[PDB]
Amino acid sequence: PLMVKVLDAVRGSPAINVAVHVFRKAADDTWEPFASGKTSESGELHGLTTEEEFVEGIYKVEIDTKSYWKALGISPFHEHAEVVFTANDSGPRRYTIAALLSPYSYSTTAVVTNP
Amino acid sequence: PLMVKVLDAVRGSPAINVAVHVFRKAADDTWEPFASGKTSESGELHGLTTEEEFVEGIYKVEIDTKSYWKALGISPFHEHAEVVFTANDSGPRRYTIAALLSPYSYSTTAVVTNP
Amino acid sequence: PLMVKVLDAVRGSPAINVAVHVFRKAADDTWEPFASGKTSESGELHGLTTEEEFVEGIYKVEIDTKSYWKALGISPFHEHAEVVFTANDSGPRRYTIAALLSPYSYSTTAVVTN
Amino acid sequence: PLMVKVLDAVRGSPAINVAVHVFRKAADDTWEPFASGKTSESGELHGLTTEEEFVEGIYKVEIDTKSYWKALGISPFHEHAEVVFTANDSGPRRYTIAALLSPYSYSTTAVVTN
Numbered sequence: 001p002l003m004v005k006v007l008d009a010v011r012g013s014p015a016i017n018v019a020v021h022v023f024r025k026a027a028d029d030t031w032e033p034f035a036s037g038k039t040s041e042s043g044e045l046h047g048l049t050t051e052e053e054f055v056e057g058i059y060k061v062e063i064d065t066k067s068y069w070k071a072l073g074i075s076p077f078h079e080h081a082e083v084v085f086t087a088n089d090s091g092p093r094r095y096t097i098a099a100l101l102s103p104y105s106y107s108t109t110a111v112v113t114n115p
Numbered sequence: 116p117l118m119v120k121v122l123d124a125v126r127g128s129p130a131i132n133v134a135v136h137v138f139r140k141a142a143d144d145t146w147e148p149f150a151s152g153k154t155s156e157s158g159e160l161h162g163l164t165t166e167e168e169f170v171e172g173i174y175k176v177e178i179d180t181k182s183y184w185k186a187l188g189i190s191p192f193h194e195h196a197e198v199v200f201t202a203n204d205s206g207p208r209r210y211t212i213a214a215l216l217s218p219y220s221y222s223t224t225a226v227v228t229n230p
Numbered sequence: 231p232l233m234v235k236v237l238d239a240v241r242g243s244p245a246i247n248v249a250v251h252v253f254r255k256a257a258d259d260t261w262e263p264f265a266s267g268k269t270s271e272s273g274e275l276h277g278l279t280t281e282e283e284f285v286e287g288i289y290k291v292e293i294d295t296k297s298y299w300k301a302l303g304i305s306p307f308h309e310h311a312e313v314v315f316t317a318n319d320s321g322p323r324r325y326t327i328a329a330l331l332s333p334y335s336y337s338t339t340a341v342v343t344n
Numbered sequence: 345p346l347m348v349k350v351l352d353a354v355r356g357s358p359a360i361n362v363a364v365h366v367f368r369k370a371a372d373d374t375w376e377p378f379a380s381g382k383t384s385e386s387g388e389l390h391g392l393t394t395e396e397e398f399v400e401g402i403y404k405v406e407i408d409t410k411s412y413w414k415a416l417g418i419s420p421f422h423e424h425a426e427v428v429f430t431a432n433d434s435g436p437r438r439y440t441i442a443a444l445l446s447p448y449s450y451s452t453t454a455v456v457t458n
């Protein structure tokens with residue numbers, strides 16, 4: 001129920017091998033590690049979680065954009081791109097978090113569907 | 116080799132039933148109709164053309180955003196969103212033209228792959 | 231009542247010396263030249279028109295993105311970026327058309343105020 | 345040396361009265377409060393800091409997008425929009441952090457000039 005997709009606006013391509021870390025806000029207001037992975041050759045990261053594990057909560061998806069750009073010889077502006085949202089608070093949903101990256105800019109959107 | 120994908124930034128959803136018209140610049144510098152269709156329930160429009168038909172040229176993809184918004188009770192800013200590009204000028208490629216729509220804004224990107 | 235602003239998402243800067251052409255849709259559906267200029271050091275193009283001249287109608291703002299990227303030695307995707315809209319007298323009076331440019335992408339918005 | 349600008353992609357307008365908090369990363373990796381304010385009628389927040397105070401380091405700009413949409417009676421996706429970056433003295437001296445807001449999306453860019 002959670003997929004992350006990352007595109008490169010410079011190359012016109014998927015952003016491949018981008019590290020993504022997901023956190024969930026705990027009862028004591030700290031960000032607890034929830035899941036992590038890397039985008040594939042399609043720019044997509046699947047398999048982060050399961051419908052059982054992905055309970056209601058506040059989640060942070062951190063996309064490690066700086067590491068991505070530095071490898072292309074670009075010293076970029078941002079440290080990362082973070083997307084913070086409440087999930088599943090009206091019951092289970094499927095979420096795609098998409099990010100379109102440039103060295104000094106990004107755009108992010110969510111596509112939320114009800115299975 | 117040509118796919119168009121349209122997302123709605125207000126609803127967090129695919130933009131469904133969006134009309135798309137594709138034109139190709141003719142030898143006399145006019146825009147000739149090339150293909151057309153509507154996005155599906157996934158926001159995607161497939162099957163516009165074939166690799167044989169999609170020769171080198173300058174193409175315009177016109178996405179009829181105004182008609183889309185007016186149906187949601189939004190009087191939007193733009194008449195349409197147009198994407199104009201040279202295709203296949205170094206040999207055949209596959210193109211995804213993506214657009215993320217808001218009433219007064221859109222973002223568009225291309226993902227170009229070599230089969 | 232019309233300003234155009236262009237920004238560069240690769241360099242994090244205004245997009246300077248970008249050609250901008252504005253057209254008005256004529257009664258026969260062709261695009262007639264209306265205004266043009268080049269963005270300034272701030273990425274802005276002011277003074278395109280006046281309140282008297284900028285009557286209701288459909289306008290097109292064409293931004294020459296391809297020449298901008300080529301001058302930087304970067305290969306771009308689009309031929310240009312086009313923004314097509316209706317000017318409406320019942321709305322607010324001042325229009326800013328902004329474009330944020332990347333080689334294979336652009337974002338555009340309108341800021342319409344009184 | 346730091347300005348924050350926020351725009352509304354639904355209404356085509358500045359995003360007015362949006363709370364903005366700026367933090368500086370401390371030596372122990374926590375975020376210490378640095379500056380805050382509310383965007384003006386132009387969607388801009390000026391006067392957050394001074395050249396003397398704005399030393400090299402990692403900063404976070406947090407924009408309270410959820411309250412903005414809620415005030416408009418619109419249900420949004422994000423809790424807030426965060427922009428995290430390093431201030432660098434070898435670059436140009438003035439930073440504009442801009443955010444273009446929609447209920448389920450935002451675009452952000454940096455314009456860094458001398």
Ligand SMILES: Oc1c(Br)cc(-c2ccccc2)cc1Br
Pocket residue numbers: 005007096098099100107108109111120122211213214215222223224226
């Ligand atoms: O499958 C997607 C694609 Br192709 C592009 C985008 C996109 C993200 C930001 C701006 C424009 C398009 C999003 C998704 Br989902």
Ligand SMILES: Oc1c(Br)cc(-c2ccccc2)cc1Br
Pocket residue numbers: 235237326328329330337338339341349351440441442443444451452453455
């Ligand atoms: O002064 C502006 C800045 Br700085 C950024 C934008 C902007 C445009 C498109 C996407 C994100 C920000 C618009 C304006 Br007027």
